[PDB]
Design a protein around this ligand. Structure first.
Ligand SMILES: N[C@@H](CCC(=O)N[C@@H](CS)C(=O)NCC(=O)O)C(=O)O
Length: 92
């Protein structure tokens, strides 16, 4: 399983919706609540240059926010990013 992390705040509808989407995918993931934690939020802001929640990561790859991960899903490429099963056809 990949290391999936989402940074959230408890008043934010968009972080709640992103968590919901991730739950809907059947993956395990770590939620880091930064509602009350300036240091943790600043550390992540330094990493991405983004100053909002949610921020979603898969093994150090930053996928963005609520809008971004929903766009990835419409594009059909969120599953792959999250570590869901890949199928390959082998031909001789
Ligand atoms: N369109 C963004 C919206 C993100 C956003 O506006 N987050 C707000 C809270 S609801 C925020 O991080 N405000 C700064 C803060 O709450 O500290 C997304 O898709 O993630």
């Amino acid at each position: 399983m990949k290391n999936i992390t989402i940074y959230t705040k408890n008043y934010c509808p968009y972080s709640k919706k992103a968590v919901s989407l991730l739950s809907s995918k059947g993956v395990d993931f770590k939620e880091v609540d930064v509602t009350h934690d300036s240091k943790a939020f600043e550390d992540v802001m330094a990493k991405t240059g983004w100053d909002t929640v949610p921020q979603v990561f898969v093994d150090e790859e930053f996928l963005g926010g609520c809008d971004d991960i929903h766009a990835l899903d419409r594009q059909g490429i969120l599953d792959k990013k999250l570590g869901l099963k890949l199928e390959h056809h082998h031909h001789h």
